[PDB]
Design a protein around this motif. Structure first.
Motif, mmCIF file in Angstrom:
data_model
loop_
_atom_site.group_PDB
_atom_site.id
_atom_site.type_symbol
_atom_site.label_atom_id
_atom_site.label_comp_id
_atom_site.label_asym_id
_atom_site.label_seq_id
_atom_site.Cartn_x
_atom_site.Cartn_y
_atom_site.Cartn_z
ATOM 1 N N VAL A 120 0.824 -1.198 0.000
ATOM 2 C CA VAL A 120 0.000 0.000 0.000
ATOM 3 C C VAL A 120 0.859 1.249 0.000
ATOM 4 O O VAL A 120 0.501 2.255 -0.620
ATOM 5 C CB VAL A 120 -1.036 0.016 1.134
ATOM 6 C CG1 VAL A 120 -1.950 -1.173 1.034
ATOM 7 C CG2 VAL A 120 -0.394 0.062 2.479
ATOM 8 N N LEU A 121 2.018 1.216 0.678
ATOM 9 C CA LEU A 121 2.887 2.381 0.624
ATOM 10 C C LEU A 121 3.515 2.550 -0.742
ATOM 11 O O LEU A 121 3.727 3.680 -1.175
ATOM 12 C CB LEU A 121 3.952 2.303 1.711
ATOM 13 C CG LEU A 121 3.350 2.366 3.094
ATOM 14 C CD1 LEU A 121 4.467 2.278 4.119
ATOM 15 C CD2 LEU A 121 2.562 3.635 3.298
ATOM 16 N N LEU A 153 -0.879 4.523 6.597
ATOM 17 C CA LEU A 153 -0.969 5.451 5.485
ATOM 18 C C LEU A 153 -0.917 6.876 5.977
ATOM 19 O O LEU A 153 -0.233 7.724 5.390
ATOM 20 C CB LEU A 153 -2.276 5.230 4.747
ATOM 21 C CG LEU A 153 -2.298 3.964 3.938
ATOM 22 C CD1 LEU A 153 -3.736 3.679 3.438
ATOM 23 C CD2 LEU A 153 -1.298 4.034 2.793
ATOM 24 N N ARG A 154 -1.687 7.193 7.013
ATOM 25 C CA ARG A 154 -1.722 8.568 7.470
ATOM 26 C C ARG A 154 -0.357 8.993 7.992
ATOM 27 O O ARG A 154 0.088 10.117 7.746
ATOM 28 C CB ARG A 154 -2.806 8.775 8.513
ATOM 29 C CG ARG A 154 -3.076 10.243 8.708
ATOM 30 C CD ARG A 154 -4.151 10.514 9.733
ATOM 31 N NE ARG A 154 -5.370 9.775 9.411
ATOM 32 C CZ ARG A 154 -6.279 10.155 8.530
ATOM 33 N NH1 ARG A 154 -6.161 11.307 7.877
ATOM 34 N NH2 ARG A 154 -7.313 9.341 8.310
ATOM 35 N N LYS A 155 0.338 8.089 8.680
ATOM 36 C CA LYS A 155 1.683 8.397 9.160
ATOM 37 C C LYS A 155 2.626 8.660 7.999
ATOM 38 O O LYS A 155 3.435 9.596 8.046
ATOM 39 C CB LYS A 155 2.172 7.224 10.021
ATOM 40 C CG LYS A 155 3.587 7.383 10.589
ATOM 41 C CD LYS A 155 3.914 6.319 11.654
ATOM 42 C CE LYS A 155 4.845 5.230 11.114
ATOM 43 N N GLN A 200 -7.928 -0.299 10.541
ATOM 44 C CA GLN A 200 -7.301 0.799 11.247
ATOM 45 C C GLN A 200 -5.784 0.720 11.179
ATOM 46 O O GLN A 200 -5.113 1.751 11.053
ATOM 47 C CB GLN A 200 -7.795 0.779 12.691
ATOM 48 C CG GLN A 200 -7.021 1.697 13.647
ATOM 49 C CD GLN A 200 -7.114 3.158 13.291
ATOM 50 O OE1 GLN A 200 -8.066 3.626 12.660
ATOM 51 N NE2 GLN A 200 -6.107 3.908 13.693
ATOM 52 N N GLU A 201 -5.223 -0.483 11.234
ATOM 53 C CA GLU A 201 -3.770 -0.616 11.167
ATOM 54 C C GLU A 201 -3.233 -0.031 9.876
ATOM 55 O O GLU A 201 -2.223 0.680 9.870
ATOM 56 C CB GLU A 201 -3.445 -2.103 11.276
ATOM 57 C CG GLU A 201 -2.004 -2.448 11.319
ATOM 58 C CD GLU A 201 -1.817 -3.958 11.447
ATOM 59 O OE1 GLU A 201 -1.872 -4.659 10.413
ATOM 60 O OE2 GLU A 201 -1.663 -4.442 12.587
ATOM 61 N N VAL A 202 -3.899 -0.316 8.764
ATOM 62 C CA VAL A 202 -3.445 0.197 7.476
ATOM 63 C C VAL A 202 -3.717 1.687 7.366
ATOM 64 O O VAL A 202 -2.871 2.444 6.879
ATOM 65 C CB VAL A 202 -4.085 -0.605 6.323
ATOM 66 C CG1 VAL A 202 -3.731 0.008 4.987
ATOM 67 C CG2 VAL A 202 -3.620 -2.042 6.340
ATOM 68 N N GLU A 258 4.615 12.219 7.309
ATOM 69 C CA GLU A 258 6.068 12.328 7.270
ATOM 70 C C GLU A 258 6.575 12.752 5.911
ATOM 71 O O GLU A 258 7.590 13.452 5.823
ATOM 72 C CB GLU A 258 6.700 10.980 7.606
ATOM 73 C CG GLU A 258 6.493 10.550 9.037
ATOM 74 C CD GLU A 258 7.077 9.159 9.327
ATOM 75 O OE1 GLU A 258 7.458 8.442 8.378
ATOM 76 O OE2 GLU A 258 7.115 8.780 10.512
ATOM 77 N N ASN A 259 5.918 12.329 4.841
ATOM 78 C CA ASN A 259 6.435 12.515 3.494
ATOM 79 C C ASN A 259 5.801 13.668 2.765
ATOM 80 O O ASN A 259 6.419 14.213 1.846
ATOM 81 C CB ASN A 259 6.221 11.252 2.660
ATOM 82 C CG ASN A 259 7.163 10.162 3.037
ATOM 83 O OD1 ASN A 259 8.239 10.035 2.446
ATOM 84 N ND2 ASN A 259 6.798 9.377 4.048
#
Lengths: 248, 248
Positions: free
Chosen positions: A141-142, A188-190, A182-184, A194-195
């Motif tokens: 997903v990233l 993604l939000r993190k 929620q884990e995914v 950061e990016n």
């Protein structure tokens, strides 16, 4: 949480009679909270839905598009949609990645062009069952998200909605658990924080899709990083009203 | 000759304003001879054209379709088109074979399904420049046609129109000469006569497409095995009227 979205992906379904009946149902459902509802009919049904849909919480989306008009028999372009009044599009749906050759670079190019043309975009990402079992979910997903991100400026993210749809959950009845989703979404939000930027991350809607129904929607929406739903099968039914209301 | 066809493939082009103006032009052109005119707008413009087009010689066609409704985000199915009143479809256009992965077996399956569902089908075939220069034109077009034929019964051919469009002529300005086109049309008709039936061959429309314009149309139509045209660029212009009239 940012404003939720409840999006109906009708896929390749509908008749004029069934759509007229369902739109009436949606029109008569009074929505009291702040939510953006989206309905994505097939291309040929867009004018019918434009004519009949009156609920002020709804916008109409296309299910796909190509970036430019021209010699592309069978396809519909972003300028054509804009001219007819459609300024939302779903891009990179699993069905198009699987059946119709849309690679990450094709999806990323479409998303970039849609943003340049002023669309709101629901960009779809998600892992297959084999990738999940190989403990590759985050990498996949990233990688899909960063391919999109590589073609966007920070400002364009105001137009982007991400939809996480595990491929194994689409149409199968096997919804992700709230914890799985929620884990995914958190990962993604993190990554976005950061990016891209923490301001972008705080306002970004990340939707879950894959076997959402009116009974499981509320326990998905209770999770902190889930901002609504992209709904296939259940959006063809009157219980989409309760999916909307699960975003209260 | 059988009844000619003049078909407008608008491809991925148009705005509501430009379409309204062009349809008015087509409506005001009185056609005095027996010809089937076909206009193929993008999916989203089908309802507009249905509402505005009044010339009795015209039918509306889709530019593509898939065979069945279901979980095919972005696509439009044959049942959906039938329900909205569209019962012509173009299948296997070079642009879809090239850009969108339509192999001979995919095209043949689509054509078969369209025929089963009662559509009139314009099925496109044609060779590339490399194939032409390798003296493979006949092998290629007969291989494309026999792939379609393998999925059809003899009765279904009443619904089929073939469109021979050399790929090197599509959109390039380099129209085939009347002799080049006639050579291929004759070969196709002979193949149909021998492999399907002489009654089928005599009634089959074989259209030429690839850089047809109002000035070259009449000298193509003079050839005995050319039954009309599939027109791209020039069908977006008022001179489509003269292309129609070149089939007298």
């Amino acid at each position: 949480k940012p404003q939720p979205i409840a999006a109906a992906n009708w896929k390749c379904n509908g008749t004029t009679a069934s759509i007229e009946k369902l739109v009436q149902v949606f029109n008569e459902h009074t929505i009291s909270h702040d939510v953006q509802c989206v309905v994505a009919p097939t291309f040929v049904h867009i004018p019918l839905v434009q004519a009949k849909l009156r609920n002020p919480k709804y916008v109409i989306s296309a299910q796909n598009a190509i970036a430019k008009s021209g010699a592309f028999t069978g396809e519909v372009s972003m300028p054509i949609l804009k001219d007819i009044g459609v300024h939302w599009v779903i891009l990179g749906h699993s069905e198009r990645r699987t059946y119709y050759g849309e690679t990450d670079e094709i999806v990323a190019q479409k998303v970039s062009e849609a943003c340049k043309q002023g669309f709101m975009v629901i960009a779809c990402i998600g892992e297959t069952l084999q990738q999940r079992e190989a403990n590759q979910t985050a990498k996949v997903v990233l990688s899909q998200t960063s391919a999109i991100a590589a073609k966007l400026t920070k400002d364009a993210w105001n137009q982007v909605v991400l939809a996480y749809e595990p491929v194994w959950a689409i149409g199968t009845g096997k919804v992700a658990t709230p914890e799985q989703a929620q884990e995914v979404h958190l990962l993604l939000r993190k990554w976005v924080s950061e990016n891209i930027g923490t301001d972008v991350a705080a306002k970004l809607r990340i939707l879950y899709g894959g076997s959402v129904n009116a009974a499981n929607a509320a326990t998905l929406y209770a999770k902190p990083d889930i901002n609504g739903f992209l709904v296939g099968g259940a959006s063809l039914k009157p219980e989409f009203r309760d999916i909307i209301d699960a975003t209260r």
